[PDB]
Amino acid sequence: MREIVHIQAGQCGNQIGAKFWEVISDEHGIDPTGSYHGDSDLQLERINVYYNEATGNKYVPRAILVDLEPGTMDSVRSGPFGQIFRPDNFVFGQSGAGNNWAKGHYTEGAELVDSVLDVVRKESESCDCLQGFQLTHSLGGGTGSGMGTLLISKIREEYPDRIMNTFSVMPSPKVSDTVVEPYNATLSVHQLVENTDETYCIDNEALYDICFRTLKLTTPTYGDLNHLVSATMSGVTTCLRFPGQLNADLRKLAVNMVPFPRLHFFMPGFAPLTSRGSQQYRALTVPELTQQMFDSKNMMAACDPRHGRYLTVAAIFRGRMSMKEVDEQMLNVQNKNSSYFVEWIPNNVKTAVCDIPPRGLKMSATFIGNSTAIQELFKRISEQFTAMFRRKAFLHWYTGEGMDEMEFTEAESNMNDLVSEYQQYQDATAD
Amino acid sequence: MREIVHIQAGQCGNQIGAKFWEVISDEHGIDPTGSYHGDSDLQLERINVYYNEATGNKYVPRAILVDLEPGTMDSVRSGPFGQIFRPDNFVFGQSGAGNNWAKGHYTEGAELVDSVLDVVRKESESCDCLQGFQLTHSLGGGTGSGMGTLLISKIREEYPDRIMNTFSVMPSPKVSDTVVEPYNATLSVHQLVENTDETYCIDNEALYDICFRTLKLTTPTYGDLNHLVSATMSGVTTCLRFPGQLNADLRKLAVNMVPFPRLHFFMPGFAPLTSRGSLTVPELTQQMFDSKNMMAACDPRHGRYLTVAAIFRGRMSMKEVDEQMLNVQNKNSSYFVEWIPNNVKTAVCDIPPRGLKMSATFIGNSTAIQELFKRISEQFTAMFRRKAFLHWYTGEGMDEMEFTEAESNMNDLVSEYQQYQDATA
Amino acid sequence: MRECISIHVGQAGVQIGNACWELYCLEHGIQPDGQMPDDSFNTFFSETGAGKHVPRAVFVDLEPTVIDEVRTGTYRQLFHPEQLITGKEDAANNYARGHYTIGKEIIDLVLDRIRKLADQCTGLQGFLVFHSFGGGTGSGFTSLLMERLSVDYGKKSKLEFSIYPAPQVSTAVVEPYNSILTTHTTLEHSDCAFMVDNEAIYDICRRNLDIERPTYTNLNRLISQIVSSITASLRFDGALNVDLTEFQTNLVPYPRIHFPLATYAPVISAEKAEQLSVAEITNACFEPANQMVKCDPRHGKYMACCLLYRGDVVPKDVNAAIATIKTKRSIQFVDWCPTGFKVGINYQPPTVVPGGDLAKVQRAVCMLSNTTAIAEAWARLDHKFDLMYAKRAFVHWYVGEGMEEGEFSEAREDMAALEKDYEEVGVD
Amino acid sequence: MRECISIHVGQAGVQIGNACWELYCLEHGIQPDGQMPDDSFNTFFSETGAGKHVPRAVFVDLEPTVIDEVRTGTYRQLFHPEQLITGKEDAANNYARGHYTIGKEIIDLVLDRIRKLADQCTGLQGFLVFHSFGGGTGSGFTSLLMERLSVDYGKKSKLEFSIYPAPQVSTAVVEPYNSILTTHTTLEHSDCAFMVDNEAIYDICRRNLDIERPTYTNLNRLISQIVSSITASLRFDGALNVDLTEFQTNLVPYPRIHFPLATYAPVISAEKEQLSVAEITNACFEPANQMVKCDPRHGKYMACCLLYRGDVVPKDVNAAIATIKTKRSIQFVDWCPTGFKVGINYQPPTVVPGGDLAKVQRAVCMLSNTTAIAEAWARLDHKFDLMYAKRAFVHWYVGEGMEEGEFSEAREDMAALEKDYEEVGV
Amino acid sequence: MEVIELNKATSGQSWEVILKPPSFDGVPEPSLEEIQKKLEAAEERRKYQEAELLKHLAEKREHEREVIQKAIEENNNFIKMAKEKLAQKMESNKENREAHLAAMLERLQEKDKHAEEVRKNKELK
Ligand SMILES: Nc1nc2c(ncn2[C@@H]2O[C@H](COP(=O)(O)OP(=O)(O)OP(=O)(O)O)[C@@H](O)[C@H]2O)c(=O)[nH]1
Ligand SMILES: Nc1nc2c(ncn2[C@@H]2O[C@H](COP(=O)(O)OP(=O)(O)OP(=O)(O)O)[C@@H](O)[C@H]2O)c(=O)[nH]1
Numbered sequence A: 001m002r003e004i005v006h007i008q009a010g011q012c013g014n015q016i017g018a019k020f021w022e023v024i025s026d027e028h029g030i031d032p033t034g035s036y037h038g039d040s041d042l043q044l045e046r047i048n049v050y051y052n053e054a055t056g057n058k059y060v061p062r063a064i065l066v067d068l069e070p071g072t073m074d075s076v077r078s079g080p081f082g083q084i085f086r087p088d089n090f091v092f093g094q095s096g097a098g099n100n101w102a103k104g105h106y107t108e109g110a111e112l113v114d115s116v117l118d119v120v121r122k123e124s125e126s127c128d129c130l131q132g133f134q135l136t137h138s139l140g141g142g143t144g145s146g147m148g149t150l151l152i153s154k155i156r157e158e159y160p161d162r163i164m165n166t167f168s169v170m171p172s173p174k175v176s177d178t179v180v181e182p183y184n185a186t187l188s189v190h191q192l193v194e195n196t197d198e199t200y201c202i203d204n205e206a207l208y209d210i211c212f213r214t215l216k217l218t219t220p221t222y223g224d225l226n227h228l229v230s231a232t233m234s235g236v237t238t239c240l241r242f243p244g245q246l247n248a249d250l251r252k253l254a255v256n257m258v259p260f261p262r263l264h265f266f267m268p269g270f271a272p273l274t275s276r277g278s279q280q281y282r283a284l285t286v287p288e289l290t291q292q293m294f295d296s297k298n299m300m301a302a303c304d305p306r307h308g309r310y311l312t313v314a315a316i317f318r319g320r321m322s323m324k325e326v327d328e329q330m331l332n333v334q335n336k337n338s339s340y341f342v343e344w345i346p347n348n349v350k351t352a353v354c355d356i357p358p359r360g361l362k363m364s365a366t367f368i369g370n371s372t373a374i375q376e377l378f379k380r381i382s383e384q385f386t387a388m389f390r391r392k393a394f395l396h397w398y399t400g401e402g403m404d405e406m407e408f409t410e411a412e413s414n415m416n417d418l419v420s421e422y423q424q425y426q427d428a429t430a431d
Numbered sequence B: 001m002r003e004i005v006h007i008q009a010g011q012c013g014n015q016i017g018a019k020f021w022e023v024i025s026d027e028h029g030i031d032p033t034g035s036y037h038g039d040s041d042l043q044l045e046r047i048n049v050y051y052n053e054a055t056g057n058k059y060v061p062r063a064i065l066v067d068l069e070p071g072t073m074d075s076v077r078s079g080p081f082g083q084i085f086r087p088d089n090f091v092f093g094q095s096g097a098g099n100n101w102a103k104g105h106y107t108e109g110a111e112l113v114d115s116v117l118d119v120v121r122k123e124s125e126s127c128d129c130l131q132g133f134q135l136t137h138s139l140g141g142g143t144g145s146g147m148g149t150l151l152i153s154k155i156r157e158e159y160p161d162r163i164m165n166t167f168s169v170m171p172s173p174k175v176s177d178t179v180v181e182p183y184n185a186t187l188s189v190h191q192l193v194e195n196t197d198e199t200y201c202i203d204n205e206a207l208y209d210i211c212f213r214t215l216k217l218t219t220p221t222y223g224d225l226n227h228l229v230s231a232t233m234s235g236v237t238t239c240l241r242f243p244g245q246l247n248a249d250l251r252k253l254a255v256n257m258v259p260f261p262r263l264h265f266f267m268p269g270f271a272p273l274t275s276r277g278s279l280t281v282p283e284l285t286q287q288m289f290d291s292k293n294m295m296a297a298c299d300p301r302h303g304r305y306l307t308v309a310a311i312f313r314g315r316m317s318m319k320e321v322d323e324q325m326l327n328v329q330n331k332n333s334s335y336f337v338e339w340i341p342n343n344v345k346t347a348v349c350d351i352p353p354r355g356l357k358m359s360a361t362f363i364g365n366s367t368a369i370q371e372l373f374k375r376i377s378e379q380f381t382a383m384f385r386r387k388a389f390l391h392w393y394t395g396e397g398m399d400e401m402e403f404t405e406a407e408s409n410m411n412d413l414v415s416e417y418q419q420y421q422d423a424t425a
Numbered sequence C: 001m002r003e004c005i006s007i008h009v010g011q012a013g014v015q016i017g018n019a020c021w022e023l024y025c026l027e028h029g030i031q032p033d034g035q036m037p038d039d040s041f042n043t044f045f046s047e048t049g050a051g052k053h054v055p056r057a058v059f060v061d062l063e064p065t066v067i068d069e070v071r072t073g074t075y076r077q078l079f080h081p082e083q084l085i086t087g088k089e090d091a092a093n094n095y096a097r098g099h100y101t102i103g104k105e106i107i108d109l110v111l112d113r114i115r116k117l118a119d120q121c122t123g124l125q126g127f128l129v130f131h132s133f134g135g136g137t138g139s140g141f142t143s144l145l146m147e148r149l150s151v152d153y154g155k156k157s158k159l160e161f162s163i164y165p166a167p168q169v170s171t172a173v174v175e176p177y178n179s180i181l182t183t184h185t186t187l188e189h190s191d192c193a194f195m196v197d198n199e200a201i202y203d204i205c206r207r208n209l210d211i212e213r214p215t216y217t218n219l220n221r222l223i224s225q226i227v228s229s230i231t232a233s234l235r236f237d238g239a240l241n242v243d244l245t246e247f248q249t250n251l252v253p254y255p256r257i258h259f260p261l262a263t264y265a266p267v268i269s270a271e272k273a274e275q276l277s278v279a280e281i282t283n284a285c286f287e288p289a290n291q292m293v294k295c296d297p298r299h300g301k302y303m304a305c306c307l308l309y310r311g312d313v314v315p316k317d318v319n320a321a322i323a324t325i326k327t328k329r330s331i332q333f334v335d336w337c338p339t340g341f342k343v344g345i346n347y348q349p350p351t352v353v354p355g356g357d358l359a360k361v362q363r364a365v366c367m368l369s370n371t372t373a374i375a376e377a378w379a380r381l382d383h384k385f386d387l388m389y390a391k392r393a394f395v396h397w398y399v400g401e402g403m404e405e406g407e408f409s410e411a412r413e414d415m416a417a418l419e420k421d422y423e424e425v426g427v428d
Numbered sequence D: 001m002r003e004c005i006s007i008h009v010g011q012a013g014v015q016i017g018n019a020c021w022e023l024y025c026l027e028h029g030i031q032p033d034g035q036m037p038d039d040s041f042n043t044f045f046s047e048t049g050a051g052k053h054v055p056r057a058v059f060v061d062l063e064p065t066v067i068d069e070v071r072t073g074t075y076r077q078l079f080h081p082e083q084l085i086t087g088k089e090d091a092a093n094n095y096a097r098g099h100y101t102i103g104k105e106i107i108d109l110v111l112d113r114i115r116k117l118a119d120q121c122t123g124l125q126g127f128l129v130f131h132s133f134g135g136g137t138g139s140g141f142t143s144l145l146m147e148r149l150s151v152d153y154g155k156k157s158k159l160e161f162s163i164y165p166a167p168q169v170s171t172a173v174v175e176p177y178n179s180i181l182t183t184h185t186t187l188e189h190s191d192c193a194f195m196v197d198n199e200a201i202y203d204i205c206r207r208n209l210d211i212e213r214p215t216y217t218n219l220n221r222l223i224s225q226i227v228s229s230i231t232a233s234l235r236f237d238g239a240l241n242v243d244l245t246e247f248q249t250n251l252v253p254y255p256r257i258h259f260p261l262a263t264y265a266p267v268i269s270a271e272k273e274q275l276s277v278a279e280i281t282n283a284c285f286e287p288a289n290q291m292v293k294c295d296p297r298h299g300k301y302m303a304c305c306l307l308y309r310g311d312v313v314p315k316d317v318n319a320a321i322a323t324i325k326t327k328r329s330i331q332f333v334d335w336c337p338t339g340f341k342v343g344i345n346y347q348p349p350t351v352v353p354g355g356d357l358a359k360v361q362r363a364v365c366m367l368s369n370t371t372a373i374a375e376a377w378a379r380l381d382h383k384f385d386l387m388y389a390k391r392a393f394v395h396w397y398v399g400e401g402m403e404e405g406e407f408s409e410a411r412e413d414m415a416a417l418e419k420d421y422e423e424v425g426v
Numbered sequence E: 001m002e003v004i005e006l007n008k009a010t011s012g013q014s015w016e017v018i019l020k021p022p023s024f025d026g027v028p029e030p031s032l033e034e035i036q037k038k039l040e041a042a043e044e045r046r047k048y049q050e051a052e053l054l055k056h057l058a059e060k061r062e063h064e065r066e067v068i069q070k071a072i073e074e075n076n077n078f079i080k081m082a083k084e085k086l087a088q089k090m091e092s093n094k095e096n097r098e099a100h101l102a103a104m105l106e107r108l109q110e111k112d113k114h115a116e117e118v119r120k121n122k123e124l125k
């Protein structure tokens, strides 16, 4: 287990993927030229997980960039680190999905997906030991969601034995006014229940609320939101990227975090919460990091963890800190908050420490929960879906592309089935 | 009726065997280079009973050293008298018996036994008139116990007309090496009942009790116990080794000591008792029929003697010796069977054991020896009723039936001893 | 003659093998190149023409990073490359991948190497297998290896050293699953398994060595000392030796009841500012603080006690020490065990890795006891297994690798029966 | 000439043979080398072409220690190697081993050596057989030999001197068995057997010689003086018992009742006035001087001879006989005359120089056939019975090929013998 | 006493002393082959007993081989049963793991056929 293959689709997927690549590149001492300029061997020891070694002592992100809309390819090449990516790994169409899932999943996205699989096979066959794939995309649009799930299915067919992992951005009416986003999100969640192993639930609703209530940004932009996303993505891939005694990979994470195949949607959390590009004038203590981590204000999914129970938890602390103090706080938080952990999965909280803090912080903590409280997110999507579907609002955008009401009914049934399972294990007793 | 071939098997067999050769070499004046430096010809009159006379006027014990483990005989060979043994009379395996009678008797013993029998067969043909075999071994282990009884059986098949005599060390939980001592001993006693002519019951329970109670040794060791075994072995072989008017040999001893073929387990006794490093004739007579001097944990007043053979060593009035032995027989009349007239035979030898001036040694065929076997049987039953540890024996190919039959036979032996204890005239 | 082949599986098994083979080289004066300035150590080291002494051992792991440290560490020339066997993917903490999916691709390599080591033995005693209960390799590949050893070598002795999982120092939430699974499939194939509880070793390193957060190298170095006490009888010219056959005969009253309890003493901080008597260290073996498995023997019954002394220890002192033990009423032996003590004494004192935390001592003792109290450790595992298995939590990862649910309840029933066996043997 | 051949079987037969042949040599002036400065001594000694006088004797012991005692002894030059027959393995105190296992093996060798002695005789009287009751060789081989001598020498007389077991100087717990077995098998084949009770002889030495624990040498020396007195008229030209058949004529009225009681006087300590004829004649009627322990007050005499030796005048013997007739009751059976046959042998009694027996002017040996001697058989039958009821030790005899039924058949014969002694002592 | 002279010789003289005459006037009342037959019979009994001893020891020898053989048979049976058990579960696990991967690719291929029906329904309009 070494090489990960990264795929970013659609506007949101390419935007947070770019940021992801800027952020870990600075952690690993790689500049926009792909040359290493760092000071620590630790930066390079597991660098092949995300980077191919190019001739010339350079490092090329093992990254494939996809969008039906051509414009976002030009935006990335312009952005910082636009010159790091392998030019042949840009796969662009000429017309977007028009925020229409069926266009990304059945029609336009289907006409471009073999072009994508060219690059995916080339990256996959080069790998000495392919961990699997991580995809960044949004569920509310038409490309990242529709073509993005179609891609997952197609990749799963040729690589059924590798781990399939997604960073999936959940729509919120606070951030976008596109009224069909509940449709696209419900259709996509259907696909992700059936076809991925691990999905990080990145909720625009949570991101907006954090920017507005905590960071006090009256009108947060996508750059405000994506600073939360990128901090999270850096933190939840830290153990994949840096050498520890844990020797983490995507499969060991799945095996321990997912007790039931469908219940594979993680609620990520982060501390400290910061604004982008802003000096931090005081560090956070280890008890501060531990407490503020399991606090609903720090969750990237708009869910109160105190409304549910954790099935499993994985936490990573970054910076130079007493691992003894970290062991103490983490054990205490579980003893004092005992009622928020299912009692029928013993020792269901795992903690790692990484001495290398992210840029701008002396210490930080990142949290990957499998909490039954995530049903709140799916109930919210479901309620919005139904409000529209009762009226058959906008269905002709979808049937004009060949779909059928039955597909909507099924994906709604399948998501309500997912809500019930969360509830079933939330009420389950050890006795 | 000249030569005895001596065999020692397993750890215990080789430890008391080596101490035996150490002791009698001192009496016959043989130093560890086989050279004689004694002051009397009495030491050399019958020295060929146990020693071969090698070229160079050196005496080599007629001893064969056997074990399935190389450790023990390595230690023997480095012992004080280690050099005295013929180097090709060491026969030793490599992979041990695992404290398992089944291993010593069936699997590992068979692979080494014919190498032993070749060295026995060569010592035998160098004999003018082979008197028989003396074996030293324990019954609680795997090598001396399991392979020693396989040795006896095979020796009996090859020399059916030669006396078989064993010094058989009995286990007790007071001085244990392995948890399966009750199995190993019960399976061996079956064998000895069938295939030996005389067995001296050396009881580790008795030796521990003698050291602790009489000699005041708070924590007995094997050295302490083996000092009592060497005194005893020197005592019951004196008549075989030194010229007397008895001209003692193994067959004559068996004939007068064994009224019934199965009842051939002797209770040895010695007086005075001594601890390592550190007396009248009437006392020797009595102290010899006293439970504190028995090498079997059995009270002779708990049964009756069928036959007794006693030997007094040192300068002493054989009139006074004979007077006192008669007085003891008449005072204790109810502990000899009335239907074997004159069943105590006394011999004297002028030469005392080293360090003593007067000693007496006792060989008793007592019905009280049933106590020794009842103790083994109870320990056997306690384990075998739960089939504990049995799988290490069935794994070797043994049937459970072998276990029950060997104990039925030892319970029969106890019954038989009882029957003669209640016999009247 | 009398050779023993050691096999080290997965991370735990390999890293402990490092502590053991380091200790063995230091005990016998072997340098990390195998050269050397009492021949019994030949049971564990073969010798090449150039006088190089190569351990009789295989190192196996399904992923290469742990064994790569051996390949580049201090003792990288102590082993032949062919003894250090690695694949490219680990079992991902999944028994089913260690035993099937991943493990089947390297199992034939391992048995070919073992077969080659067996061919260098004139009297093979048995195999020593070191593994964790909890790892996917530790459990699943060891089960497979044990099954294949039984086909290749029949009833030839197989003893394990197994790392029982502790939440304090753990890896995976599914470890109770892997533990029950490997124990089931392995039960029929092992003759004797010495279990080691990471929580117990962890607690000893805290209380006796004043190490706040003990690391694996702390745990492993202590664990190496216990292992060495056991094998010292097979590697040295000793007064009272105990071979592999003697361990099994004296400690295992029933095929399934083959999990003796280890206890070691003294455990002294190397930075402590009086040499303990033969009696003191003997009494320490019956205190629960020095047990390698957390359980309460005073609330169980002993079925056999094997006491392995090393160093400056005289037999009269053992006999006096053990006689005291036979008079403590808190030390209860079963009714069907008339005599339960076996004693061995090797005279070379214990050896300590310089720059380690354990102090040099003039005498030490390791007790191996078969107590019914070990069942308490089996009960602790079964309860964690039952918590998750009632909801079929994580089972899908095992079914996905081709296992069937029936294998889980059949393994849990075998542990039920095992628990009921420890009850039965303790009755009167 | 009237040659007699002496056969010594087992350790007791041989060591007493030494004691006798030594005393004969002293009595006849035969030095240990065989040389010599009345011709009746030729009945017991032959002569070689070198001038050496050689005992007419064959020694048999299946154990070389006792016969090497002759090959190397003081009188070793008297014997030719062919008179000394040995083997490697004795009877192990086992009649069955002596009779059946060894006996079948050496009988033809032994009989052949006796034939070489007998071919040198112009008028062989018969054989004088010396052996123990108790040893396996003495009992077992002797009885086989007597069977064979009755076949190869049908009309020749055979006299035994049998050592009767004593617990005081015993060897073996099984001597009662061997005693009854050999007595059964030999009874038909012996004309006259002089028993020597080891307890009687032991008592005479303690009481009359002041020896606290007599050796076999003490006992054998005294036994020699008795055998000497019984044979003195065969080796000198005497007048009573001048040939072997005259022993059964004078002492054995009934063939089975052929166990006379021998009484000897005087026994005087060397380290310690010459007794009169009356004094030593009185001593023949004291049971403390009998060779076998029994009470003559409990039986009747059938025959009684007084063998005087040394300075003895008939005048004094008749007066000694008349004195005891007046004071004492001496009961003979009804069919036999009450009286004595008296013989005087002028040759003086002789002792081994340096021995414990003092030299005496005159001595006497009374041979009487009383029914009292059946008490000795009763003692042996009781011990035999005590053991045989429980079949004790019998398996050692069965193991040598003897059938259990021989034990009872032998014991029935002894029961018949006791009833015979009762019948005649009515 | 009636004395009666018997004889007179060189070294001796003998007579007979008679105290009372008897009360009663008068006196009241194996071949070589048989021997060798009896010695031979005892030898054949000795030899018969030795032969029966050696027969019982020979019976022990055969049992010892039978024990040794039983253990070799048990070890062989242990091997044969471990071999068939292990091959059984390795083939069962293979079939299972293959049947899972086939079901999972089957479901994805149904999705593929559905996509074709969606794209056809579109051109229908
Ligand atoms: N957090 C975050 N969300 C974004 C970003 N860009 C778009 N979104 C959200 O993504 C959803 C819209 O999907 P897009 O990514 O713009 O759509 P697409 O995948 O490119 O599909 P088409 O534009 O129709 O071709 C809405 O919910 C937006 O709020 C971004 O940069 N960061
Ligand atoms: N005592 C000790 N225990 C260890 C060590 N390493 C791992 N463990 C324990 O072993 C268990 C984890 O299984 P591992 O052996 O590390 O895993 P593996 O056998 O390599 O198998 P996979 O990694 O799943 O393929 C946990 O309970 C750890 O505490 C070690 O070095 N010493």
Ligand SMILES: Nc1nc2c(ncn2[C@@H]2O[C@H](COP(=O)(O)OP(=O)(O)OP(=O)(O)O)[C@@H](O)[C@H]2O)c(=O)[nH]1
Pocket: D009, D010, D011, D012, D013, D015, D016, D061, D090, D091, D092, D093, D094, D131, D132, D133, D134, D135, D136, D137, D138, D139, D163, D164, D165, D166, D169, D170, D171, D172, D175, D198, D216, D217, D219, D220, D223
């Ligand atoms: N008077 C006397 N009795 C003896 C002498 N030697 C042995 N006896 C007695 O004879 C009996 C023993 O039988 P032995 O004749 O010595 O033995 P053996 O005939 O050689 O037969 P085995 O030795 O049994 O083969 C015992 O009662 C002895 O006391 C002796 O020299 N003089």
Ligand SMILES: COc1cc(C(=O)c2nc(-c3ccc(C)c(O)c3)ccc2F)cc(OC)c1OC
Pocket: A235, A236, A237, A238, A239, A240, A246, A247, A248, A249, A250, A251, A252, A253, A256, A257, A312, A313, A314, A315, A316, A347, A348, A349, A350, A351, A352, A366, A367, A368, C171, C172, C173, C174
């Ligand atoms: C990529 O992000 C991570 C991955 C891993 C593992 O890959 C990994 N996880 C486990 C584990 C996880 C959860 C539970 C409840 C458990 O018992 C064990 C075991 C071994 C592993 F390698 C671990 C992390 O932190 C602990 C990560 O960062 C938060």
Ligand SMILES: COc1cc(C(=O)c2nc(-c3ccc(C)c(O)c3)ccc2F)cc(OC)c1OC
Pocket: B235, B236, B237, B238, B239, B240, B246, B247, B248, B249, B250, B252, B253, B256, B257, B307, B308, B309, B310, B311, B342, B343, B344, B345, B346, B347, B361, B362, B363, D171, D172, D173, D174
């Ligand atoms: C080997 O040690 C000895 C051997 C013998 C005899 O070999 C031997 N024993 C007997 C004998 C034995 C017992 C009884 C009851 C009996 O009536 C006779 C007879 C002749 C012998 F040659 C004798 C010993 O002392 C008496 C010995 O030492 C104790």
Ligand SMILES: Nc1nc2c(ncn2[C@@H]2O[C@H](COP(=O)(O)OP(=O)(O)O)[C@@H](O)[C@H]2O)c(=O)[nH]1
Pocket: B009, B010, B011, B012, B013, B015, B016, B097, B099, B137, B138, B139, B140, B141, B142, B143, B144, B145, B169, B170, B171, B172, B175, B176, B177, B178, B181, B204, B207, B222, B225, B226, B229
């Ligand atoms: N008296 C005595 N008993 C011993 C000695 N050594 C071992 N034993 C006993 O022997 C038994 C163990 O058998 P052992 O001879 O050591 O095993 P083996 O070598 O397989 O035959 C136990 O009952 C111990 O009591 C010793 O030197 N003296």
Ligand SMILES: [Mg+2]
Pocket: C010, C011, C063, C090, C091, C135, C137
């Ligand atoms: Mg691993």
